């Protein structure tokens, strides 16, 4: 799994450092990454941090943090070199020379390894350029070199104990006991610019995909822009058949025609430079991928392929963003800068595009999380983001997409979680998109706020349990693990019944009296918006999450819901905006799909509205609940709406 990795506060270690040359292990420069770290500060002497022997034979990714923290940086020192030797030679070979640290920005360096470096007997070296003083500081943290060989389509950890082979690194925690953890959990204590948690590469590919549109290239095609390119097979079989090798002296540039990417969540395409083509040398040879709207000038950066990243043919996966999933987006490939003809070629292959969710919903995440720690802190928010290039970029694991907003298909929930909406321990499933899909794929939750306390535990990512385990389990290697209470393959058994009515008039102005419903955020039981069906109703006027969640149901004999609706009329202004209306979901998985149900424009309910909804057979089942939520408001007392006389019968 991993070769090297020390973040420096986990003993400098004889076992993995040759003894230093001018360096402190400590915080002289402050925080790097977390804790302590490699710092260089005296103004004369050779600068220089050496690995002892590694067996390199299958690294594949050297890692590293680098920055002056609170020392003074460089405008005029000399560069960092990062190279290799073998057999405890003197002969260093460079890899990657870096100018000194010039901003107080910590940056993460991602190297992709030479075959040359790769064998029984390697040390790496971060070493200054001597002088002809040093005015300036620099400080390493978070050393990694990934091991390519041995690789699981699963990851399980509950940290009793840790499988220190499941994580690269997590700045800012402990594994321990707090937070009331059940056993260890991965704990934030809130101290520094990183905080999160990153696990290790594992292998999520797929043995098919089910693409809808897809192109060869088996001759040029039509309709889109190419420049520089011929239809050939220089670089070798990118994916099968033949590529666009971009080998032309000129503007080497490629562009999808302008598509309908409503119904796309993941562009894909094969990928190689150099390796039987004339490589890259430097990032001036790189290709930016960028997408474009039609009738908008705007070009929506997307990710850089770095010249030494895809020296063999490579699945390159990316998400569509909800804002690229319009009715004309085009995607487009462009290379900085090259030498010439049959100069730093690169070649694609193989363009196809899949949903957002794969139809089988082959693979999951599970885990649990704790906010705050007993302490609800605003501000405290952790996005959960996968990344399929080795930490070189990262992307939300889902990203919301809602009526009239977005065009894109309908997605409910963006995978962030804070501290607002969560208390105490929560258990969060999620079936993983298919970009995520790869064969290179981790994934990290990461505290976007500032000193935050946060916990994760139980992480379970791979293959689906059966039905995710109906959010009444915890997916395990073998199974699910059902709660108590709930039994069978899926946790589809449960010992107690649901009522098969609900009916609320909203009489009662004291929310804790509701244990006919599970949530109620973000509203008042009062006359704000007049009379709807009679008495008080349920005025939805706060600031934060407006929502309304039933508690569990037994819909299975029921024909309508039923509910009294009004958006808008001083104390019950109208939502102004698209996107401010209500949306009606419902879900029978304890809330890990919400299905939409009904959408109530922020435009058509100004005056109270009987709406009866008759119920489609999916959402007449055992186990559901019922959620009104309105996700967008400018959040003061506007964008009002408020529902009363709530029924639902069964025969
Ligand atoms: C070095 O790594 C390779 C590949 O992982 C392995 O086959 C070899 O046995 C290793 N050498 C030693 C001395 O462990
Ligand atoms: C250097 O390392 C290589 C590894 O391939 C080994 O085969 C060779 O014997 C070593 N030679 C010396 C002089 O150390
Ligand atoms: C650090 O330098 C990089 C390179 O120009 C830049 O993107 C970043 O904004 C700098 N950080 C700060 C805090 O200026
Ligand atoms: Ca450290
Ligand atoms: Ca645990
Ligand atoms: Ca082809
Ligand atoms: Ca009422
Ligand atoms: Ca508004």
Same mark, same amino acid.
């Given at each position: 799994s991993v070769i090297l990795r020390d973040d420096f506060d986990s003993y400098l270690n004889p076992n993995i450092w040759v003894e230093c040359s001018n360096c402190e292990m400590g915080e002289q420069c402050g925080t790097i990454m977390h804790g302590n770290a490699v710092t260089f500060c005296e103004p004369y002497g050779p600068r220089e941090l050496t690995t002892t022997c590694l067996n390199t034979t299958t690294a594949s990714v050297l890692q590293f943090s680098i920055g002056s923290g609170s020392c003074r940086f460089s405008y005029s020192d000399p560069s960092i070199t990062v190279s290799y030797a073998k057999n405890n030679t003197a002969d260093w070979i460079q890899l990657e020379k870096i100018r000194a640290p010039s901003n107080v920005s910590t940056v993460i360096h991602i190297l992709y390894l030479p075959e040359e470096a790769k064998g029984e007997s390697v040390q790496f070296q971060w070493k200054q350029d001597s002088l002809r003083v040093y005015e300036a500081c620099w400080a390493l943290d978070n050393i990694?070199?990934?091991?390519?060989?041995?690789?699981?389509?699963?990851?399980?950890?509950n940290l009793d104990p840790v499988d220190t082979g499941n994580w690269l690194f997590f700045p /800012?925690?402990? %594994?321990?006991?707090?937070?009331?953890?059940?056993?260890?959990?991965?704990?934030?204590?809130?101290? *520094?610019e990183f905080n999160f948690a990153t696990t290790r590469d594992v292998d999520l590919s797929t043995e098919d995909i089910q693409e809808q549109w897809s192109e060869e290239f088996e001759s040029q095609p039509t309709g889109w822009d190419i420049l520089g390119a011929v239809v050939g097979a220089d670089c070798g079989t990118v994916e099968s058949g033949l590529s666009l090798v971009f080998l032309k002296d000129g503007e080497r540039k490629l562009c999808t025609p302008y598509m309908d990417t409503?119904?796309?969540?993941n562009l894909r395409f094969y990928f190689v430079m150099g390796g039987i083509?004339?490589?890259?040398?430097?990032?001036?040879?790189?290709?930016?991928?960028?997408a474009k709207i039609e /009738?908008?000038?705007?070009?929506?950066?997307?990710?850089?392929?770095?010249?030494?990243?895809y020296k063999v043919p490579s699945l390159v996966s990316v998400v569509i963003n909800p804002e690229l999933q319009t009715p004309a987006t085009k995607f487009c490939l462009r290379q900085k800068s090259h030498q010439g003809y049959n100069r730093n070629v690169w070649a694609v292959d193989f363009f196809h595009v899949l949903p957002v969710l794969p139809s089988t919903m082959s693979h999951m995440i !599970?885990?649990?999380?704790?906010?705050?720690?007993?302490?609800?802190?605003?501000?405290?928010? %952790?996005?959960?983001?996968?990344?399929?290039?080795?930490?070189? *970029?990262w992307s939300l694991l889902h990203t919301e997409c809602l009526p009239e907003i977005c065009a894109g298909p309908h997605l409910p929930h963006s995978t962030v979680y804070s501290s607002?909406?969560?208390? /105490?321990?929560?258990?969060?499933?999620?079936?993983?998109?298919?970009?995520?899909?790869?064969?290179?794929t981790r994934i990290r939750w990461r505290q976007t706020g500032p000193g935050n306390m946060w916990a994760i535990d139980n992480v379970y990512i791979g293959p689906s349990c059966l039905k995710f385990c109906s959010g009444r389990g915890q997916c395990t290697r073998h199974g699910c693990k059902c709660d108590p209470g709930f039994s069978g393959p899926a946790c589809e058994m449960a010992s107690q019944t649901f009522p098969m009515f609900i009916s609320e008039s909203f009489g009662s102005a004291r929310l804790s009296s509701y244990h006919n419903f599970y949530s109620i955020r973000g509203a008042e039981v009062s006359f704000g918006c007049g009379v709807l069906a009679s008495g008080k109703a349920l005025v939805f006027n706060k600031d934060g999450r407006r929502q309304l969640i039933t508690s569990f149901l037994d819909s299975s004999q029921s024909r309508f819901l039923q509910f009294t609706l009004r958006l808008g009329s001083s104390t019950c202004r109208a939502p102004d905006q698209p996107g401010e209306g209500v949306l009606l979901h419902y879900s029978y998985d304890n809330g890990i799909t919400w299905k939409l149900l009904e959408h109530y *424009?922020? %435009?058509?309910?100004?005056?109270?509205?009987?709406?009866?909804?008759?119920?489609?057979?999916?959402?007449? !089942?055992?186990?559901? !609940?019922?959620?009104?939520?309105?996700?967008?408001?400018?959040? !003061?007392g506007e964008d009002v709406w408020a529902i009363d006389e709530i029924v639902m019968t069964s025969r």
């Open positions: 990694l070199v990934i091991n390519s060989a041995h690789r699981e389509v699963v990851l399980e950890d /800012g925690a402990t %594994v321990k006991h707090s937070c009331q953890s059940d056993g260890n959990s991965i704990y934030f204590h809130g101290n *520094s409503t119904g796309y969540g083509c004339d490589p890259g040398v430097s990032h001036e040879n790189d290709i930016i991928l960028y /009738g908008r000038k705007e070009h929506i950066a997307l990710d850089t392929l770095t010249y030494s990243s !599970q885990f649990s999380i704790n906010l705050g720690c007993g302490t609800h802190q605003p501000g405290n928010s %952790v996005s959960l983001e996968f990344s399929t290039n080795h930490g070189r *970029s607002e909406n969560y208390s /105490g321990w929560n258990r969060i499933t999620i079936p993983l998109p298919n970009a995520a899909l790869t064969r290179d *424009s922020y %435009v058509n309910y100004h005056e109270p509205r009987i709406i009866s909804v008759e119920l489609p057979d999916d959402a007449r !089942q055992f186990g559901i !609940q019922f959620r009104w939520w309105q996700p967008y408001h400018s959040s !003061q």
